Write an enzyme that holds these catalytic residues in place. Structure first.
Site, PDB file in Angstrom:
ATOM      1  N   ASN A 281     116.734 -51.417 -25.447  1.00 12.29           N
ATOM      2  CA  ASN A 281     116.578 -52.964 -25.524  1.00 12.29           C
ATOM      3  C   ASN A 281     117.571 -53.570 -24.762  1.00 12.29           C
ATOM      4  O   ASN A 281     117.450 -54.447 -24.169  1.00 12.29           O
ATOM      5  CB  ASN A 281     116.567 -53.478 -27.005  1.00 12.29           C
ATOM      6  CG  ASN A 281     114.813 -53.636 -27.433  1.00 12.29           C
ATOM      7  OD1 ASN A 281     113.913 -53.459 -26.553  1.00 12.29           O
ATOM      8  ND2 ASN A 281     114.520 -53.531 -28.601  1.00 12.29           N
TER       9      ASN A 281
ATOM     10  N   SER B  28     112.748 -46.864 -23.687  1.00 10.40           N
ATOM     11  CA  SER B  28     112.617 -48.577 -24.098  1.00 10.40           C
ATOM     12  C   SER B  28     113.887 -49.100 -24.603  1.00 10.40           C
ATOM     13  O   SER B  28     113.733 -50.072 -25.462  1.00 10.40           O
ATOM     14  CB  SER B  28     111.470 -48.238 -25.094  1.00 10.40           C
ATOM     15  OG  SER B  28     110.510 -49.521 -24.675  1.00 10.40           O
TER      16      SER B  28
ATOM     17  N   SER C  77     107.273 -54.326 -25.040  1.00 12.91           N
ATOM     18  CA  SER C  77     108.204 -53.459 -24.291  1.00 12.91           C
ATOM     19  C   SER C  77     107.639 -53.048 -22.771  1.00 12.91           C
ATOM     20  O   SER C  77     108.330 -52.694 -22.203  1.00 12.91           O
ATOM     21  CB  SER C  77     108.882 -52.335 -25.052  1.00 12.91           C
ATOM     22  OG  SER C  77     109.692 -52.424 -25.822  1.00 12.91           O
TER      23      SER C  77
ATOM     24  N   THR D  29     105.397 -51.802 -27.858  1.00 13.51           N
ATOM     25  CA  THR D  29     105.138 -51.876 -29.382  1.00 13.51           C
ATOM     26  C   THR D  29     105.906 -53.116 -29.910  1.00 13.51           C
ATOM     27  O   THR D  29     107.027 -53.288 -29.919  1.00 13.51           O
ATOM     28  CB  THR D  29     105.654 -50.505 -30.059  1.00 13.51           C
ATOM     29  OG1 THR D  29     105.213 -49.437 -29.260  1.00 13.51           O
ATOM     30  CG2 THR D  29     105.014 -50.517 -31.211  1.00 13.51           C
TER      31      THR D  29
ATOM     32  N   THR E 297     105.314 -47.958 -22.170  1.00 14.91           N
ATOM     33  CA  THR E 297     104.561 -48.279 -23.391  1.00 14.91           C
ATOM     34  C   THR E 297     105.141 -49.478 -23.938  1.00 14.91           C
ATOM     35  O   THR E 297     106.219 -49.807 -23.549  1.00 14.91           O
ATOM     36  CB  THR E 297     105.096 -47.227 -24.838  1.00 14.91           C
ATOM     37  OG1 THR E 297     106.362 -47.338 -24.805  1.00 14.91           O
ATOM     38  CG2 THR E 297     104.358 -46.199 -24.470  1.00 14.91           C
TER      39      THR E 297
ATOM     40  N   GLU F 290     113.111 -61.289 -29.262  1.00 11.90           N
ATOM     41  CA  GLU F 290     112.304 -62.418 -29.756  1.00 11.90           C
ATOM     42  C   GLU F 290     110.669 -62.328 -28.820  1.00 11.90           C
ATOM     43  O   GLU F 290     109.900 -62.758 -29.587  1.00 11.90           O
ATOM     44  CB  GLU F 290     113.151 -63.586 -29.343  1.00 11.90           C
ATOM     45  CG  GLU F 290     114.168 -63.704 -30.166  1.00 11.90           C
ATOM     46  CD  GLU F 290     115.386 -63.141 -29.730  1.00 11.90           C
ATOM     47  OE1 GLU F 290     115.474 -62.724 -28.619  1.00 11.90           O
ATOM     48  OE2 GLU F 290     115.998 -62.646 -30.727  1.00 11.90           O
TER      49      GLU F 290
ATOM     50  N   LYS G 145     109.082 -53.833 -19.479  1.00  9.66           N
ATOM     51  CA  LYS G 145     110.228 -53.099 -18.976  1.00  9.66           C
ATOM     52  C   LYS G 145     110.012 -52.458 -17.878  1.00  9.66           C
ATOM     53  O   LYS G 145     111.031 -52.030 -16.869  1.00  9.66           O
ATOM     54  CB  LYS G 145     110.810 -52.013 -19.881  1.00  9.66           C
ATOM     55  CG  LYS G 145     111.602 -53.117 -20.889  1.00  9.66           C
ATOM     56  CD  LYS G 145     111.999 -52.145 -22.228  1.00  9.66           C
ATOM     57  CE  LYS G 145     112.343 -53.050 -23.466  1.00  9.66           C
ATOM     58  NZ  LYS G 145     112.349 -52.288 -24.744  1.00  9.66           N
TER      59      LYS G 145
END
Lengths: 261, 164
Positions: A102, A100, A40, A207, A205, A138, A43
Protein backbone atom coordinates in the site's frame (compact mmCIF):
# COMPACT_ATOMS: atom_id res chain seq x y z
CA UNK A 1 -24.96 -16.86 -18.85
CA UNK A 2 -27.27 -19.11 -16.78
CA UNK A 3 -24.24 -20.50 -14.95
CA UNK A 4 -23.03 -16.98 -14.08
CA UNK A 5 -26.47 -16.05 -12.72
CA UNK A 6 -26.59 -19.15 -10.53
CA UNK A 7 -23.06 -18.52 -9.24
CA UNK A 8 -23.78 -14.91 -8.35
CA UNK A 9 -27.05 -15.92 -6.62
CA UNK A 10 -25.19 -18.39 -4.41
CA UNK A 11 -22.58 -15.73 -3.72
CA UNK A 12 -25.31 -13.24 -2.73
CA UNK A 13 -24.07 -10.44 -5.00
CA UNK A 14 -23.01 -9.47 -8.54
CA UNK A 15 -20.18 -10.92 -10.59
CA UNK A 16 -18.62 -9.14 -13.62
CA UNK A 17 -16.68 -11.12 -16.22
CA UNK A 18 -15.02 -10.34 -19.53
CA UNK A 19 -12.62 -12.67 -21.31
CA UNK A 20 -11.00 -12.50 -24.75
CA UNK A 21 -9.17 -15.19 -26.68
CA UNK A 22 -6.50 -13.19 -28.54
CA UNK A 23 -6.14 -16.03 -31.07
CA UNK A 24 -9.74 -16.54 -32.19
CA UNK A 25 -11.17 -13.20 -31.13
CA UNK A 26 -13.88 -15.04 -29.16
CA UNK A 27 -15.16 -13.40 -25.98
CA UNK A 28 -17.21 -14.16 -22.91
CA UNK A 29 -19.16 -11.35 -21.27
CA UNK A 30 -21.32 -11.14 -18.10
CA UNK A 31 -22.14 -7.72 -16.62
CA UNK A 32 -19.02 -6.64 -18.54
CA UNK A 33 -20.22 -3.04 -18.90
CA UNK A 34 -21.12 -2.55 -15.22
CA UNK A 35 -18.88 -0.67 -12.78
CA UNK A 36 -17.08 -2.54 -10.00
CA UNK A 37 -14.60 -1.14 -7.43
CA UNK A 38 -10.97 -1.55 -8.50
CA UNK A 39 -9.59 -2.05 -4.97
CA UNK A 40 -5.88 -2.92 -5.18
CA UNK A 41 -6.23 -4.05 -8.80
CA UNK A 42 -5.49 -0.43 -9.73
CA UNK A 43 -1.86 -1.11 -8.78
CA UNK A 44 -1.14 -3.11 -11.90
CA UNK A 45 -2.19 -0.21 -14.10
CA UNK A 46 -0.19 2.10 -11.85
CA UNK A 47 2.97 0.08 -12.56
CA UNK A 48 2.20 0.25 -16.27
CA UNK A 49 1.82 4.03 -16.05
CA UNK A 50 5.17 4.24 -14.27
CA UNK A 51 6.72 2.16 -17.07
CA UNK A 52 5.24 4.42 -19.77
CA UNK A 53 6.53 7.49 -18.00
CA UNK A 54 10.07 5.97 -17.90
CA UNK A 55 9.94 6.06 -21.72
CA UNK A 56 9.97 9.88 -21.45
CA UNK A 57 11.95 10.31 -18.23
CA UNK A 58 15.39 8.73 -18.30
CA UNK A 59 16.45 6.95 -15.16
CA UNK A 60 13.02 7.07 -13.54
CA UNK A 61 12.97 3.38 -12.48
CA UNK A 62 16.37 3.73 -10.81
CA UNK A 63 15.38 6.83 -8.86
CA UNK A 64 15.74 6.26 -5.08
CA UNK A 65 12.70 7.32 -3.06
CA UNK A 66 13.16 8.27 0.61
CA UNK A 67 10.21 8.18 2.99
CA UNK A 68 9.56 8.15 6.74
CA UNK A 69 7.06 6.40 8.98
CA UNK A 70 4.31 8.90 8.21
CA UNK A 71 4.23 7.41 4.69
CA UNK A 72 3.38 3.94 6.02
CA UNK A 73 -0.12 2.46 5.78
CA UNK A 74 -1.38 -1.00 6.78
CA UNK A 75 -0.50 -3.85 4.38
CA UNK A 76 2.95 -2.56 3.35
CA UNK A 77 5.23 -5.64 3.66
CA UNK A 78 8.02 -4.38 1.43
CA UNK A 79 7.98 -0.63 2.04
CA UNK A 80 7.81 -1.16 5.84
CA UNK A 81 11.07 -3.14 5.72
CA UNK A 82 13.05 -0.72 3.53
CA UNK A 83 12.07 2.36 5.49
CA UNK A 84 15.63 3.06 6.65
CA UNK A 85 17.18 2.93 3.17
CA UNK A 86 14.39 3.96 0.81
CA UNK A 87 13.48 2.08 -2.36
CA UNK A 88 13.81 2.74 -6.08
CA UNK A 89 10.82 3.45 -8.30
CA UNK A 90 11.31 -0.05 -9.80
CA UNK A 91 11.35 -1.72 -6.37
CA UNK A 92 8.26 0.24 -5.37
CA UNK A 93 6.50 -0.90 -8.54
CA UNK A 94 7.44 -4.56 -7.99
CA UNK A 95 6.15 -4.33 -4.41
CA UNK A 96 2.85 -2.70 -5.40
CA UNK A 97 2.17 -5.31 -8.10
CA UNK A 98 3.47 -8.50 -6.48
CA UNK A 99 2.71 -7.92 -2.78
CA UNK A 100 -0.07 -5.36 -3.15
CA UNK A 101 2.12 -3.03 -1.02
CA UNK A 102 0.00 0.00 0.00
CA UNK A 103 2.61 2.58 0.96
CA UNK A 104 4.53 1.73 -2.21
CA UNK A 105 1.42 2.36 -4.35
CA UNK A 106 0.86 5.77 -2.69
CA UNK A 107 4.49 6.74 -3.23
CA UNK A 108 4.11 5.87 -6.91
CA UNK A 109 0.79 7.67 -7.24
CA UNK A 110 2.60 10.77 -5.92
CA UNK A 111 5.23 10.37 -8.68
CA UNK A 112 2.48 10.33 -11.34
CA UNK A 113 0.34 13.26 -10.15
CA UNK A 114 -2.02 11.28 -7.98
CA UNK A 115 -5.20 9.35 -8.84
CA UNK A 116 -6.05 11.94 -11.53
CA UNK A 117 -2.65 11.37 -13.15
CA UNK A 118 -3.20 7.62 -13.34
CA UNK A 119 -6.69 8.19 -14.75
CA UNK A 120 -5.28 10.51 -17.43
CA UNK A 121 -2.77 7.82 -18.46
CA UNK A 122 -5.60 5.28 -18.79
CA UNK A 123 -7.58 7.77 -20.92
CA UNK A 124 -4.43 8.08 -23.09
CA UNK A 125 -4.54 4.39 -24.02
CA UNK A 126 -8.22 4.66 -24.97
CA UNK A 127 -9.82 3.57 -21.69
CA UNK A 128 -12.80 5.90 -21.10
CA UNK A 129 -14.21 3.91 -18.16
CA UNK A 130 -11.39 3.64 -15.63
CA UNK A 131 -11.36 6.19 -12.81
CA UNK A 132 -9.18 6.42 -9.74
CA UNK A 133 -10.30 9.11 -7.34
CA UNK A 134 -8.69 8.35 -4.00
CA UNK A 135 -5.50 6.92 -2.43
CA UNK A 136 -4.85 3.83 -0.29
CA UNK A 137 -6.64 3.04 1.92
CA UNK A 138 -9.67 5.26 1.34
CA UNK A 139 -10.26 3.96 -2.20
CA UNK A 140 -11.49 0.65 -0.73
CA UNK A 141 -14.87 1.88 0.55
CA UNK A 142 -16.78 0.05 -2.21
CA UNK A 143 -20.12 1.79 -1.50
CA UNK A 144 -22.85 0.40 -3.74
CA UNK A 145 -23.56 2.73 -6.72
CA UNK A 146 -20.52 4.88 -5.95
CA UNK A 147 -18.57 5.45 -9.19
CA UNK A 148 -15.36 6.55 -7.38
CA UNK A 149 -12.41 4.18 -7.93
CA UNK A 150 -14.15 1.83 -10.35
CA UNK A 151 -13.93 0.39 -13.84
CA UNK A 152 -15.76 -2.29 -15.86
CA UNK A 153 -14.61 -5.86 -16.54
CA UNK A 154 -14.43 -5.15 -20.27
CA UNK A 155 -12.45 -1.93 -19.82
CA UNK A 156 -9.99 -3.69 -17.47
CA UNK A 157 -9.46 -6.53 -19.92
CA UNK A 158 -9.12 -4.25 -22.97
CA UNK A 159 -6.56 -2.04 -21.20
CA UNK A 160 -4.67 -5.05 -19.84
CA UNK A 161 -4.43 -6.48 -23.36
CA UNK A 162 -3.11 -3.15 -24.74
CA UNK A 163 -0.43 -2.89 -22.08
CA UNK A 164 0.77 -6.52 -21.99
CA UNK A 165 0.27 -7.76 -25.57
CA UNK A 166 -0.45 -4.65 -27.62
CA UNK A 167 1.55 -1.52 -28.34
CA UNK A 168 0.60 0.78 -25.45
CA UNK A 169 4.08 0.25 -23.98
CA UNK A 170 7.39 0.03 -25.81
CA UNK A 171 8.79 -3.52 -25.97
CA UNK A 172 11.25 -3.45 -23.04
CA UNK A 173 8.69 -1.79 -20.76
CA UNK A 174 6.00 -4.23 -21.91
CA UNK A 175 8.16 -7.24 -20.99
CA UNK A 176 8.92 -5.69 -17.60
CA UNK A 177 5.15 -5.32 -16.96
CA UNK A 178 4.58 -8.95 -17.96
CA UNK A 179 7.45 -10.09 -15.71
CA UNK A 180 5.93 -8.23 -12.72
CA UNK A 181 2.45 -9.72 -13.26
CA UNK A 182 3.96 -13.20 -13.74
CA UNK A 183 5.65 -12.84 -10.35
CA UNK A 184 2.56 -11.76 -8.42
CA UNK A 185 2.23 -13.63 -5.09
CA UNK A 186 -1.36 -12.79 -4.14
CA UNK A 187 -3.41 -14.56 -6.78
CA UNK A 188 -3.03 -18.26 -6.06
CA UNK A 189 -6.71 -18.77 -5.12
CA UNK A 190 -8.24 -16.74 -7.91
CA UNK A 191 -7.71 -16.93 -11.70
CA UNK A 192 -4.60 -19.07 -11.16
CA UNK A 193 -6.84 -21.57 -9.29
CA UNK A 194 -9.00 -21.97 -12.41
CA UNK A 195 -6.34 -23.09 -14.86
CA UNK A 196 -4.04 -26.09 -15.39
CA UNK A 197 -0.78 -25.81 -13.49
CA UNK A 198 1.27 -25.76 -16.68
CA UNK A 199 -0.26 -22.56 -18.08
CA UNK A 200 1.73 -19.37 -17.39
CA UNK A 201 -0.36 -16.62 -15.72
CA UNK A 202 0.37 -13.00 -14.84
CA UNK A 203 -2.27 -11.32 -12.68
CA UNK A 204 -3.14 -8.56 -10.24
CA UNK A 205 -5.70 -8.96 -7.47
CA UNK A 206 -7.88 -6.52 -5.59
CA UNK A 207 -9.66 -6.94 -2.25
CA UNK A 208 -11.69 -4.06 -0.71
CA UNK A 209 -12.67 -5.94 2.44
CA UNK A 210 -16.29 -4.78 2.52
CA UNK A 211 -19.43 -5.23 0.40
CA UNK A 212 -18.38 -8.63 -0.91
CA UNK A 213 -15.95 -6.77 -3.18
CA UNK A 214 -12.81 -8.40 -4.64
CA UNK A 215 -11.33 -9.18 -8.04
CA UNK A 216 -8.53 -10.45 -10.24
CA UNK A 217 -7.42 -9.81 -13.82
CA UNK A 218 -4.88 -11.79 -15.76
CA UNK A 219 -3.15 -12.74 -18.99
CA UNK A 220 -3.17 -16.52 -19.32
CA UNK A 221 -0.99 -18.45 -21.80
CA UNK A 222 -2.55 -21.90 -22.27
CA UNK A 223 -0.27 -24.61 -23.60
CA UNK A 224 0.01 -24.29 -27.38
CA UNK A 225 -2.55 -21.47 -27.72
CA UNK A 226 -2.64 -17.68 -28.10
CA UNK A 227 -3.00 -15.82 -24.76
CA UNK A 228 -6.37 -15.18 -23.13
CA UNK A 229 -6.95 -11.94 -21.20
CA UNK A 230 -9.69 -11.77 -18.61
CA UNK A 231 -11.09 -9.88 -15.64
CA UNK A 232 -13.36 -11.13 -12.86
CA UNK A 233 -14.85 -8.55 -10.42
CA UNK A 234 -17.38 -9.03 -7.60
CA UNK A 235 -19.51 -6.87 -5.32
CA UNK A 236 -22.43 -7.38 -2.92
CA UNK A 237 -25.17 -5.21 -1.40
CA UNK A 238 -24.33 -5.46 2.30
CA UNK A 239 -21.28 -3.93 3.95
CA UNK A 240 -20.72 -7.15 5.91
CA UNK A 241 -21.05 -9.51 2.92
CA UNK A 242 -17.64 -11.19 2.53
CA UNK A 243 -15.90 -11.63 -0.80
CA UNK A 244 -15.16 -15.16 -1.97
CA UNK A 245 -11.98 -16.18 -3.81
CA UNK A 246 -13.64 -19.46 -4.77
CA UNK A 247 -16.38 -17.49 -6.54
CA UNK A 248 -13.71 -15.60 -8.52
CA UNK A 249 -12.01 -18.88 -9.48
CA UNK A 250 -15.35 -20.49 -10.40
CA UNK A 251 -16.30 -17.57 -12.67
CA UNK A 252 -12.88 -17.84 -14.24
CA UNK A 253 -13.52 -21.53 -15.01
CA UNK A 254 -16.87 -20.65 -16.59
CA UNK A 255 -15.18 -17.97 -18.71
CA UNK A 256 -12.47 -20.32 -20.01
CA UNK A 257 -15.06 -23.01 -20.61
CA UNK A 258 -17.02 -20.34 -22.51
CA UNK A 259 -14.06 -19.70 -24.82
CA UNK A 260 -13.67 -23.48 -25.15
CA UNK A 261 -10.36 -23.85 -23.30
CA UNK B 1 3.20 -27.74 11.43
CA UNK B 2 1.01 -25.37 9.34
CA UNK B 3 1.50 -21.72 8.25
CA UNK B 4 3.20 -18.85 10.06
CA UNK B 5 1.41 -17.94 13.32
CA UNK B 6 1.54 -15.40 16.15
CA UNK B 7 2.78 -18.13 18.47
CA UNK B 8 5.70 -18.79 16.17
CA UNK B 9 6.37 -15.06 15.86
CA UNK B 10 6.53 -14.78 19.64
CA UNK B 11 8.81 -17.84 19.89
CA UNK B 12 11.32 -16.20 17.56
CA UNK B 13 13.72 -13.94 19.50
CA UNK B 14 15.98 -11.03 18.65
CA UNK B 15 19.44 -12.51 18.35
CA UNK B 16 18.45 -15.77 16.67
CA UNK B 17 20.15 -17.01 13.50
CA UNK B 18 18.64 -17.52 10.07
CA UNK B 19 18.39 -21.26 10.63
CA UNK B 20 16.71 -20.87 14.01
CA UNK B 21 14.10 -18.60 12.40
CA UNK B 22 13.41 -21.05 9.57
CA UNK B 23 13.20 -24.00 11.96
CA UNK B 24 10.52 -22.22 14.02
CA UNK B 25 8.51 -20.63 11.18
CA UNK B 26 8.64 -23.65 8.85
CA UNK B 27 10.85 -23.15 5.82
CA UNK B 28 8.02 -23.78 3.34
CA UNK B 29 6.25 -20.68 4.70
CA UNK B 30 9.21 -18.39 4.17
CA UNK B 31 11.10 -16.64 1.39
CA UNK B 32 14.28 -14.62 1.10
CA UNK B 33 16.00 -12.74 -1.70
CA UNK B 34 14.08 -10.75 -4.27
CA UNK B 35 11.98 -7.93 -2.87
CA UNK B 36 13.13 -8.92 0.63
CA UNK B 37 16.90 -8.99 0.08
CA UNK B 38 18.56 -10.84 2.94
CA UNK B 39 15.56 -10.65 5.28
CA UNK B 40 13.29 -13.65 5.89
CA UNK B 41 9.57 -13.20 5.22
CA UNK B 42 7.08 -15.77 6.55
CA UNK B 43 3.40 -16.09 5.54
CA UNK B 44 0.31 -17.09 7.46
CA UNK B 45 -3.18 -17.36 5.95
CA UNK B 46 -4.71 -14.95 3.39
CA UNK B 47 -5.85 -11.55 4.72
CA UNK B 48 -6.28 -8.07 3.24
CA UNK B 49 -5.18 -8.48 -0.39
CA UNK B 50 -2.14 -10.38 0.83
CA UNK B 51 -1.38 -12.60 3.85
CA UNK B 52 -0.90 -12.34 7.55
CA UNK B 53 2.91 -12.26 7.74
CA UNK B 54 6.14 -11.82 9.67
CA UNK B 55 9.40 -10.27 8.47
CA UNK B 56 12.73 -10.84 10.18
CA UNK B 57 15.70 -8.56 9.52
CA UNK B 58 19.29 -9.55 10.26
CA UNK B 59 22.46 -7.68 11.27
CA UNK B 60 24.01 -8.50 7.89
CA UNK B 61 23.85 -10.83 4.90
CA UNK B 62 26.34 -13.07 6.69
CA UNK B 63 25.21 -16.61 7.49
CA UNK B 64 25.89 -16.12 11.19
CA UNK B 65 23.92 -12.84 11.23
CA UNK B 66 21.43 -12.29 14.06
CA UNK B 67 17.80 -11.15 14.14
CA UNK B 68 17.76 -7.37 14.70
CA UNK B 69 14.28 -6.64 13.40
CA UNK B 70 10.80 -8.20 13.81
CA UNK B 71 7.71 -7.06 11.89
CA UNK B 72 4.23 -8.54 11.57
CA UNK B 73 0.73 -7.79 10.38
CA UNK B 74 -2.32 -9.87 11.38
CA UNK B 75 -0.37 -12.45 13.41
CA UNK B 76 -1.01 -10.89 16.83
CA UNK B 77 -4.37 -9.72 18.19
CA UNK B 78 -4.72 -6.81 20.67
CA UNK B 79 -5.77 -8.11 24.08
CA UNK B 80 -8.37 -5.38 24.70
CA UNK B 81 -8.92 -2.84 21.88
CA UNK B 82 -10.35 0.49 23.14
CA UNK B 83 -8.77 3.12 20.91
CA UNK B 84 -11.04 5.99 19.84
CA UNK B 85 -10.60 9.09 17.71
CA UNK B 86 -10.72 11.07 20.94
CA UNK B 87 -7.96 9.02 22.58
CA UNK B 88 -5.90 9.25 19.38
CA UNK B 89 -6.13 13.02 19.51
CA UNK B 90 -4.76 13.04 23.07
CA UNK B 91 -1.59 11.21 22.09
CA UNK B 92 1.24 13.73 21.65
CA UNK B 93 4.73 13.67 20.16
CA UNK B 94 7.29 13.41 22.95
CA UNK B 95 5.20 10.99 25.06
CA UNK B 96 6.81 7.85 26.46
CA UNK B 97 5.59 4.44 25.49
CA UNK B 98 3.97 4.22 28.94
CA UNK B 99 2.14 7.52 28.41
CA UNK B 100 0.90 6.41 24.99
CA UNK B 101 -0.39 3.09 26.30
CA UNK B 102 -2.28 4.79 29.15
CA UNK B 103 -3.85 7.12 26.58
CA UNK B 104 -4.95 4.66 23.86
CA UNK B 105 -5.68 1.70 26.16
CA UNK B 106 -3.28 -0.82 27.71
CA UNK B 107 -4.59 -3.62 25.47
CA UNK B 108 -5.20 -1.61 22.32
CA UNK B 109 -1.87 -2.19 20.61
CA UNK B 110 0.30 -4.83 18.99
CA UNK B 111 3.88 -4.42 17.77
CA UNK B 112 3.98 -3.78 14.04
CA UNK B 113 7.74 -3.38 13.86
CA UNK B 114 10.67 -3.31 16.29
CA UNK B 115 14.21 -2.62 15.01
CA UNK B 116 17.63 -2.34 16.73
CA UNK B 117 20.00 -0.55 14.33
CA UNK B 118 22.85 -0.98 16.83
CA UNK B 119 22.00 -4.54 17.89
CA UNK B 120 22.92 -5.95 20.36
CA UNK B 121 22.75 -2.40 21.76
CA UNK B 122 19.25 -0.98 22.27
CA UNK B 123 20.42 2.57 21.43
CA UNK B 124 18.31 4.06 18.64
CA UNK B 125 15.56 1.42 18.87
CA UNK B 126 12.63 2.21 16.59
CA UNK B 127 9.13 0.88 17.23
CA UNK B 128 5.83 0.99 15.40
CA UNK B 129 2.65 0.05 17.23
CA UNK B 130 -0.56 -0.88 15.47
CA UNK B 131 -3.50 0.10 17.66
CA UNK B 132 -7.15 -0.81 17.26
CA UNK B 133 -10.62 0.34 18.25
CA UNK B 134 -13.09 -2.18 19.69
CA UNK B 135 -13.87 -3.81 16.33
CA UNK B 136 -10.72 -2.63 14.59
CA UNK B 137 -8.84 -5.91 14.42
CA UNK B 138 -10.53 -8.39 12.08
CA UNK B 139 -9.88 -10.71 7.77
CA UNK B 140 -7.08 -8.14 7.92
CA UNK B 141 -9.51 -5.33 7.13
CA UNK B 142 -9.51 -3.01 10.12
CA UNK B 143 -12.48 -0.98 11.33
CA UNK B 144 -10.43 1.89 12.72
CA UNK B 145 -6.73 1.66 13.51
CA UNK B 146 -3.72 3.82 14.19
CA UNK B 147 0.05 3.69 13.72
CA UNK B 148 2.12 5.12 16.58
CA UNK B 149 5.87 5.30 16.12
CA UNK B 150 8.78 5.78 18.54
CA UNK B 151 12.53 6.21 18.65
CA UNK B 152 14.37 5.41 21.91
CA UNK B 153 11.01 4.92 23.57
CA UNK B 154 9.71 8.40 22.70
CA UNK B 155 6.76 9.01 20.38
CA UNK B 156 7.87 10.61 17.09
CA UNK B 157 4.58 10.66 15.24
CA UNK B 158 1.12 9.23 14.77
CA UNK B 159 -1.43 8.47 12.05
CA UNK B 160 -4.97 7.01 12.09
CA UNK B 161 -7.49 5.51 9.66
CA UNK B 162 -11.26 5.52 10.16
CA UNK B 163 -11.23 6.28 13.85
CA UNK B 164 -14.39 7.72 15.41
Amino acid sequence: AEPFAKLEQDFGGSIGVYAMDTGSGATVSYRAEERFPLCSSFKGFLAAAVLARSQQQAGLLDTPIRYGKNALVPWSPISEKYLTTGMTVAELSAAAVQYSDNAAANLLLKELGGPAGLTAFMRSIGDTTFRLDRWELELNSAIPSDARDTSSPRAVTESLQKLTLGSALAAPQRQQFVDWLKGNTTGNHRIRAAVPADWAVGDKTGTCGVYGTANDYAVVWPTGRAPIVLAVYTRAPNKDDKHSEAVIAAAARLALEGLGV
Amino acid sequence: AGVMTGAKFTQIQFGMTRQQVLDIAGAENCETGGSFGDSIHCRGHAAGDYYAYATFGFTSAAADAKVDSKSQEKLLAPSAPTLTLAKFNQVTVGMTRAQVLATVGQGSCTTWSEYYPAYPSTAGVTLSLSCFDVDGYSTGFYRGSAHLWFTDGVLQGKRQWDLV
